[PDB]
């Protein structure tokens, strides 16, 4: 396997890396506590697009009932860490 | 080299009236040719699996 | 337009193509609410019985006992002799027996006759 | 058993020279064997005996009489 | 002049000139063509295009 | 849409407890305690206790027990060609009849 | 999996799920990245052209022929992630998930090893023993009469309280126990 | 193949079928009627125990090849002259079989022409 | 011994659509009047060592040069040795 | 043969005068010693028999069954040791006394040189079984099961008594040797047909034949573990032994009188194998598997060829051992689960690995895997029936396929998969259960080395 034990700050770096390349939002204004619907003015379809982007980049897929209620990068990181059982 | 051919019936299992069942091995061309090929393939596969399923 | 999907017994209609949830009325919403309510009640009871540290046994499930009783021990008392049941029983319990008996009887008569007339070539047939 | 190779995250993975030279050597060995075998024996690929044409065979060796004798 | 040649080529030649069913001949030829085709598919889709695996 | 405040609080508390448990799953350096108690060379001994001994046993069993009974081991008679000589008799097989050889 | 479901899906939920499924199957059809991006943008264009419709009768008339169109070109062999309920490694590790309570049956000789782990286990067991007695009362006093209407559970409200029914959720074998 | 297309698309009786050949007497062609020769006897072919399908008129070269392969064992490609001779003789035998096929075809052709001419003469 | 080295991610300014076949996609989207927001996200698939691709035929004859050189040398040696 | 019967009788004063906490040890030890003594009967000769006296004789057909009967008692005591923990001393001693009486009656039955003595003991073996089923039974349906088991057997067996006394009146002797030496053909008549039916149905109801098998699932499900093993292992073989003994006088009537029973068995094997597939209970599944195997044995006995007899004897022994092991495993699962349902407990292989290994071995043996004696008997019967008629192979192959299917289904449902979450009383398997399974399985893999010991007198 040789899979490195991915950690929370690594996960947060990956989320910020994926988001900063989404040109619809400005990287300077984004924050790890920033919202999507209000603080960035993103559409629901756009939110689905980021959810699928994380799906593709992390190699695991999020169920719809859990994906539609993620609106901040911090809770995305929390969900991924809970799914993959990360300590620190 | 020669074309040696042989069948070995070592252990006589049981006799049912006029039928005799014994542990008989046939070592014909097919067997003597397929033993090394299968053993070589199994050796390579085992060496590969020593790495594939270390976890 | 596109070719229609015709559902069958072994290929049922998909949920998305089904039209029941596209005709939406308040009573349908009430029915869904009641279904969710009873499901949540059962789930809450199960979880209450599930996380108890004092419990050291198997959670008896009334549905499983009911299913087993219905499958095994409740068939005869609800059985009635009707033309459909009687006909199906007679067929499925008598027809195969007589069919196989006829087949084997004809085969053995043919073999036995060939034995009498002598064109069977039973050479080397020692074990029997 | 091997060497330490670290992930890259959107960069090309590290390549040790050993695997590259081994792969190139084995591909070259295969192609050299194919060329050598073909050069030494061209018969297996194209046949070693011409196919006779049945139309050219004269009627004399086939025992055909000119429609009058028998 | 590879390992599969010495078997498959002779198989095809022996199949071609025996008093056999013609449909079997046609299906065998189409089958070996499709064999080459799916080997091509594997190689092309697994070793040629731009990478598509997770970052 | 989105998380309700009750849902957020419950998820946060559950996550904290889960992380605490997962950290508790670790092993200290002293955690595995093993109570001790006892009552070319590698290939050299391997070929001795795994190859040579079975060869000896099989050879003995075949050559003084299997062949003692009749027809237990029967071998295909070797091919005889024109030109060879027989060990048992010494006679020579006559050759062919000089077939015409061109190309 | 984590979140409790509602009695029904709103129209927005259905639209979003159809959009996600259509994009997934389109990506499955178009193997390469550039083609996928081009046709995904085209799909988004043809998807948002009816965004501002007002009457729900016509919107429900839509998303019905759309479902039929999706089912006609659904790529009968879609791409499924390895851990998904259709993937190649869906339930691969389910044979390794050993329940925690099994550790209660270990022989004392086996419990001699890993002593600190078992001490922490006893601490956790005592914590659960108190927390359960608090949680039953909290849930009894919080639920409405006639039984719960949804399978959503409240969090812990006091200081020393813990979320109700947390023992099963908090302790699990792992994602990959071995 | 063309012969199969000719038989299954033209006239069936025009050219023969492999099952029933030969249909004409051997002496129809020429009266000398030379006999095929076999240089390997029954006993030595049995002793070499080649095969049941390998005991044909080409057996002597096969026996020589087997003798070579048994003699010079470690050099598995030691002798190819006798191998080439065996293939050459097999090719000759295949040529003779094709000669039989073409002879049967042409003789059936001439028989059909004779029958047609006789029928026309009787009618005329 | 495992892979613990604290890998650093690259910067996000490096990935640009320029020099990739995403220009055709972007131009054909702008022709009908749209754009791809995720265009840069996959630019890494065309940027680094993955930029140069080999055709199927070119991939097939992986080592023709070395094999042909060895074959020519061997044939020359055999010709000059057997001719003796 | 008194060297075997007398110690079995002495087992009763031994167990009654034993201490309150040492009955199991003494009973197990001395029953194992009795089995060791009874092992000497296996040395048969190609000639007639081991005629011990005017009352008892031993053949090479009675020897394997006698050895199995003597060997089953220690396993019965080891299996019954679990659920009788909270039982008073007197009732435990009564249970052991009933088991000992059952063993004694079976031992006296299997030799029984005279047919009336054989019938008397073969009906006497019915009382301890009924008492065991009806008294130490868990469910409330044990009473109906006991009534069914008693009456189904007795209705068939009552005309057998009349047939036997009539045969004694006409022929003049019911000793088996005189019967075999003085046998005469039965003419084709209505009276002879009814004599055949009376002599045959008594043994056919006990195997049982398809259509008369309704008592077996009830008796096997409702009985305790020891009752289940003694039913599946030995008490079913009584019909086979009796018919192979008595069919020596029914020729040549049997050639044309076997058709209804042959057809019934060759279709009931398929029917019961299919029934095994859709079953919500374990013990019922093993019971129906036993019914299928006994139907195959019935077919073999009715064919009446030497290979049929050899395969029938081998199949009887193998099926007895395998069914006893399967019932053991089901009982160990039920003791922890307390429910007796296939799908309530799943994925037990992750929790109990060695018991999963035992489950796999038992399923493989029941699957008729070579070179186990199961397949030896199976294949002998297959070849004999093929010689009888070439179309039997279709039914036999269908039965084999369904047997493999339901065996692997039973293995997979209870061993593979994800464990049930709400069950946390799966304690690790004791040493007693593992020893019980080992003692069940090792004799099979040992007998596969010397098949001639269980191939019957026609070897
Ligand atoms: C050993 C291995 C395994 C083998 C064992 C298992 C298999 C063998 C045993 C089991 C099978 C045997 C079944 C045959 C006898 C059982 C029938 C019975 O007991 O009647 C109870 C039952 C008692 O009558 P009821 O309760 O007063 O009336 C209830 C019905 O609703 C009233 O019905 P209805 O009025 O609507 O119609 C009745 C009428 C209508 O007839 C029909 O509908 C179809 C025709 C059926 C028979 C004709 C062909 O039937 C006739 O008139 C036929 C008369 C001739 O009668 C029936 O319901 C059955 C009537 C049909 C007879 C079918 C028998 C033919 C079977 C083949 C022989
Ligand atoms: C192949 C020949 C081998 C020769 C070497 C000698 C072997 C002697 C074995 C005697 C019988 C075994 C005792 C049965 C209970 C096993 C004890 C146990 O609980 O295991 C724990 C123990 C320690 O493991 P653990 O980690 O502590 O426990 C974790 C769990 O148990 C987790 O358990 P697990 O995951 O490790 O799995 C347990 C394992 C072991 O458990 C078993 O299943 C063993 C039982 C397999 C028999 C299945 C019934 C079918 C009828 C076969 C009757 C043949 C018997 C012949 C006479 C036997 C004498 C006793 O099961 C298997 O591996 C699958 C077995 C399926 C094999 C299918 C092939 C059958 C026919 C092969 C040809 C036979 C005749 C050849 C004639 C021509 C050639 C000369 O493992 C073992 O002891 C394994 C033993 C070796 C496996 C033997 C399998 C084939 C051998 C059958 C008899 C040999 C015939 C003579 C050939 C001579 C040349
Ligand atoms: C190196 C050796 C390798 C092989 C070892 C083989 C071991 C064999 C031991 C097992 C014996 C199997 C049981 C068979 C015994 C039944 C036969 C019995 O009826 O014979 C009796 C006689 O048997 C022996 O005398 C006693 C047998 C009982 C002892 C068995 C030995 C092992 C038992 C150990 C049990 C407990 C061990 C210690 C526990 C703490 C009386 O027969 P009888 O009708 O007069 O014979 C007349 C012919 N005469 C006149 C020639 C004598
Ligand atoms: C249900 C679960 C299974 C239970 C057990 C089933 C097995 C018992 C079934 C009986 C088997 C066959 C019995 C009789 C077979 C003889 C052949 C005879 O029946 O066929 C013709 C006979 O014709 C008629 O069948 C006469 C008998 C008719 C009356 C019998 C009842 C038939 C249906 C009843 C079935 C009920 C069975 C279950 C009862 C509970 C032949 O004519 P013929 O050659 O001249 O006479 C032969 C006898 N001779 C030579 C001595 C003169
Ligand atoms: C082991 C350690 C000891 C090694 C030193 C001894 C070396 C060999 C010397 C032993 C002497 C030979 C011997 O054992 O006697 C032969 C003896 C049998 O005696 P027979 O009389 O020939 O046949 C029985 C009928 N009378 O042969 C043996 O038992 C030993 C070899 C038999 C094969 C081994 C078992 C393999 C097969 C296992 C059974 C599988 C099921 C049956 C297979 C089905 C085949 C149809
Ligand atoms: C699980 C339920 C199974 C039920 C089994 C019961 C049925 C068994 C078959 C009938 C049993 C009775 C047979 C009589 C006992 C045999 C004695 C005998 O054969 O003697 C005959 C006498 O034969 C008879 O008397 C038979 C009469 C039978 C009357 C009772 C009928 C019972 C039911 C019969 C039909 C059912 C048969 C099949 C049942 C299948 C199972 C349900 C010879 O007469 P003689 O006087 O010597 O004549 C010589 C001078 N000419
Ligand atoms: C290869 C297979 C191809 C399959 C193609 C499937 C068919 C494609 C064409 C589908 C046609 C439609 O769009 S059907 C159009 C369905 N009707 C509506 O969209 C009306 C109002 N829509 C909303 O309100 C939504 O929420 C929305 C504004 C979209 C988002 O909102 P947010 O994000 O703010 O939350």
Please state the oligomeric state of the protein chains shown. Answer: part of a larger assembly
Listing every helix as H and every strand as E from the N terminus to the C terminus, the arrangement of chain G reads: HHHHHHH
The biggest beta sheet of chain F is recorded as:
none
End-to-end separation of chain G in angstroms reads: 23 Å
Helix proportion range of chain F = 40-55%
Name the biggest interface.
Answer: C-J, 25 and 33 residues
Please report the total strand number of chain G as a whole number.
Answer: 0
Shape of chain G: flat
Report how far apart the termini of chain F are.
Answer: 93 Å
What proportion strand of chain G?
Answer: under 5%
Reported for the largest beta sheet of chain G, the result is:
none
**Helical stretch count of chain F?**
2
Number of distinct helices of chain G: 7
As a whole number of angstroms, the C-alpha radius of gyration of chain F is 40 Å
The chain-level structural class of chain G is mainly alpha
Order of helices and strands of chain F: HHE
- Structural class of the helix and strand makeup of chain F? mainly alpha
Provide the gyration radius of chain G in Å.
Answer: 25 Å
Which ligands, by name, code or SMILES, are bound? cardiolipin, the ligand CCCCCCCCCCCCCCCCC[C@@H](O)O[C@H](CO[C@H](O)CCCCCCCCCCCCCCC)COP(=O)(O)OCC[N+](C)(C)C, 1,2-dioleoyl-sn-glycero-3-phosphoethanolamine, the ligand CCCCCCCCCCCC(=O)SCCNC(=O)CCNC(=O)[C@H](O)C(C)(C)COP(=O)(O)O
Subcellular location (chain E): Mitochondrion inner membrane
Protein name (chain E): NADH-ubiquinone oxidoreductase chain 5
Family (chain E): Belongs to the complex I subunit 5 family.
Organism (chain E): Sus scrofa
């Amino acid at each position: 396997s040789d899979a490195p034990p991915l950690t929370l700050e690594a996960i947060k770096d990956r989320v910020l890396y994926v988001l900063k390349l989404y040109d619809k939002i400005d990287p300077e204004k984004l924050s790890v506590n920033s919202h999507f619907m209000k603080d960035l003015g993103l559409d629901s379809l756009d939110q689905v697009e980021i959810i699928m982007a994380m799906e593709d980049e992390f190699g695991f897929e999020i169920p719809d009932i859990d994906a539609e209620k993620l609106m901040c990068p911090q809770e995305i990181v929390d969900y991924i860490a809970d799914k993959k059982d990360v300590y620190e | 080299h020669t074309g040696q051919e042989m069948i070995i019936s070592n252990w006589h299992w049981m006799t049912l009236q006029t039928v005799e069942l014994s542990l008989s091995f046939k070592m014909d061309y097919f067997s003597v040719m397929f033993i090394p090929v299968a053993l070589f393939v199994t050796w390579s596969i085992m060496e590969f699996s020593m790495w594939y399923m270390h976890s | 337009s596109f070719p229609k999907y015709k559902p069958s017994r072994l290929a049922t209609l998909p949920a998305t193509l089904d039209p029941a949830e596209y005709d939406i009325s308040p009573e349908t919403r009430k029915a869904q609410a009641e279904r969710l309510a009873i499901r949540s009640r059962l789930k809450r009871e199960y979880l209450l019985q599930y996380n108890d540290p004092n419990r050291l046994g198997v959670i008896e499930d009334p549905a499983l006992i009911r299913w087993t009783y219905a499958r095994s021990a409740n068939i005869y008392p609800n059985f009635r002799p009707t033309p459909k049941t009687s006909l199906l029983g007679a067929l499925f319990g008598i027809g195969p027996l007589f069919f196989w008996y006829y087949v084997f009887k004809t085969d053995r008569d043919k073999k036995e006759k060939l034995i009498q007339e002598g064109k069977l070539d039973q050479t080397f047939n020692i074990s029997y | 058993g091997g060497v330490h190779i670290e992930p890259r995250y959107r960069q090309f993975p590290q390549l040790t020279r050993s695997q590259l030279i081994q792969a190139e050597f084995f591909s070259a060995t295969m192609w050299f064997w194919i060329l050598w075998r073909f050069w030494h024996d061209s018969d297996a690929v194209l046949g070693h005996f011409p196919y006779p044409d049945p139309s050219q065979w004269t009627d004399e060796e086939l025992g055909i009489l000119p429609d009058d004798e028998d | 002049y590879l390992t599969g040649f010495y078997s498959k080529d002779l198989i095809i030649e022996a199949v071609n000139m025996s008093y056999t069913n013609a449909w079997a001949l046609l299906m065998t030829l189409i089958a070996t063509s499709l064999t080459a085709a799916y080997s091509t598919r594997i190689i092309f889709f697994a070793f040629l295009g731009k990478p598509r695996f997770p970052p | 849409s989105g998380y309700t405040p009750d849902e957020k609080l419950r998820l946060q508390q559950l996550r904290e407890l889960r992380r605490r448990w997962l950290k508790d799953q670790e092993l200290s350096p002293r955690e595995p305690v093993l109570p001790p108690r006892r009552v070319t060379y590698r290939h050299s001994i391997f070929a001795v206790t795994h190859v040579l001994i079975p060869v000896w046993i099989i050879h003995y069993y075949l050559k003084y027990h299997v062949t003692a009974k009749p027809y237990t081991v029967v071998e295909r008679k070797p091919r005889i060609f024109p030109g060879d000589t027989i060990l048992e008799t010494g006679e020579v097989i006559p050759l062919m009849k000089e077939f015409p050889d061109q190309h | 999996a984590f979140s409790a479901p509602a009695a029904y899906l709103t129209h927005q939920q259905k639209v979003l799920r159809l959009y996600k499924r259509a994009l997934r199957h389109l990506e499955s059809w178009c193997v390469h990245r550039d083609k996928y991006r081009y046709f995904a943008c085209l799909m988004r264009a043809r998807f948002d052209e009816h965004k501002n419709e007002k009457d729900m009768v016509k919107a429900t008339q839509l998303l019905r022929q759309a479902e039929e169109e999706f089912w006609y070109g659904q790529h009968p062999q879609p791409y499924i992630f390895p851990e998904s309920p259709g993937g190649t490694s869906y339930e691969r590790y389910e044979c390794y998930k050993v329940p925690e309570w099994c550790l209660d049956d270990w022989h004392p000789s086996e419990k001699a090893m890993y002593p600190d782990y078992f001490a922490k286990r006893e601490q956790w067991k005592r914590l659960r023993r108190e927390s359960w007695e608090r949680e039953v009362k909290q849930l009894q006093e919080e639920t409405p009469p006639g039984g719960p209407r949804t399978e959503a559970l409240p969090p812990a409200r006091k200081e020393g309280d813990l979320p109700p029914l947390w023992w099963h959720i908090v302790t699990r074998p792992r994602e990959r126990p071995m | 193949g063309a012969h199969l297309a000719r038989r299954y698309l033209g006239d069936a009786s025009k050219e023969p079928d492999p099952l029933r050949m030969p249909t004409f007497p051997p002496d129809y062609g020429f009266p000398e009627r030379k006999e095929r020769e076999m240089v390997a006897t029954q006993q030595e072919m049995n002793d070499a125990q080649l095969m049941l399908q390998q005991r044909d008129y080409c057996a002597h070269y096969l026996i020589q090849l087997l003798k070579c392969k048994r003699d010079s064992f470690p050099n598995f490609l030691a002798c190819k002259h006798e191998q080439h001779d065996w293939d050459y003789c097999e090719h000759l035998d295949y040529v003779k079989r094709m000669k039989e096929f073409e002879r049967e075809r042409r003789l059936l052709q001439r028989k059909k022409r004779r029958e047609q001419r006789e029928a026309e003469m009787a009618r005329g | 011994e495992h892979g613990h080295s604290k890998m650093e991610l690259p910067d996000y300014k490096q990935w640009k659509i320029e020099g990739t076949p995403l220009e055709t996609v972007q131009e054909k989207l702008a022709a009908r009047g749209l754009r791809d927001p995720w265009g840069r996200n996959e630019a890494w698939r065309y940027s680094g060592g993955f930029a140069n691709n080999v055709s199927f035929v070119g991939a097939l004859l992986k080592g023709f040069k070395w094999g042909f050189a060895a074959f020519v040398v061997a044939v020359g040696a055999e010709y000059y040795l057997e001719s003796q | 043969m008194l060297k075997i019967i007398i110690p079995t009788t002495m087992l009763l004063p031994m167990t009654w005068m034993s201490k309150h906490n040492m009955i199991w040890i003494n009973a197990t030890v001395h029953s194992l010693l009795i089995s060791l003594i009874s092992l000497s009967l296996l040395n048969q000769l190609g000639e007639n028999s081991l005629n011990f006296s005017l009352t008892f004789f031993s053949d090479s057909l009675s020897a394997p069954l006698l050895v199995l009967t003597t060997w089953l008692l220690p396993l019965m005591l080891m299996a019954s040791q679990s659920h009788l923990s909270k039982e008073t001393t007197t009732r435990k001693k009564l249970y052991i006394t009933m088991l000992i009486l059952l063993q004694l009656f079976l031992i006296m039955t299997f030799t029984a040189t005279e047919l009336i003595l054989f019938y008397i003991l073969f009906e006497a073996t019915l009382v301890p079984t009924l008492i065991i089923i009806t008294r130490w039974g868990n469910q409330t349906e044990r009473l109906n099961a006991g009534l069914y088991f008693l009456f189904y057997t007795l209705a068939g067996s009552l005309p057998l008594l009349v047939a036997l006394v009539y045969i004694q009146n006409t022929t003049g002797s019911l000793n088996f040797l005189i019967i075999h030496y003085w046998s005469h053909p039965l003419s084709n008549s209505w009276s002879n047909i009814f004599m055949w039916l009376a002599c045959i149905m008594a043994f056919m109801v006990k195997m049982p034949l398809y259509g008369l098998h309704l008592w077996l699932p009830k008796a096997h499900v409702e009985a305790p573990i020891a009752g289940s093993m003694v039913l599946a292992a030995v008490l079913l073989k009584l019909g086979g032994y009796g018919m192979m003994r008595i069919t020596t006088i029914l020729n040549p009537l049997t050639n044309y009188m076997a058709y209804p029973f042959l057809m019934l068995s060759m279709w009931g094997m398929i029917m019961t194998s299919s029934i095994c597939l859709r079953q919500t209970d374990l013990k019922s599944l093993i019971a129906y598997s036993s019914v299928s195997h006994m139907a195959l044995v019935i077919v073999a006995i009715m064919i009446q060829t030497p290979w049929s007899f050899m395969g029938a004897t081998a199949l009887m022994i193998a099926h007895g051992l395998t069914s006893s092991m399967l019932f053991c495993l089901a009982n160990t699962n039920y003791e922890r689960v307390h429910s007796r349902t296939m799908i309530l407990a799943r994925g037990l292989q992750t929790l109990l690995p060695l018991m999963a290994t035992w489950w796999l071995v038992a399923s493989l043996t029941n699957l008729a895997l070579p070179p186990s004696i199961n397949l030896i008997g199976e294949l002998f019967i297959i070849t004999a029936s093929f010689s009888w008629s070439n179309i039997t192979i279709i039914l036999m192959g269908m039965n084999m396929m369904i047997t493999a299917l339901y065996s692997l289904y039973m293995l997979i449902t209870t061993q593979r998969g994800k464990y049930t979450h709400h069950i946390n009383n799966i304690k690790p398997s004791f040493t007693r259960e593992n020893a019980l399974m080992a003692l069940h399985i090792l004799p099979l893999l040992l007998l596969t080395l010397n098949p001639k010991m269980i191939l019957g007198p026609l070897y």
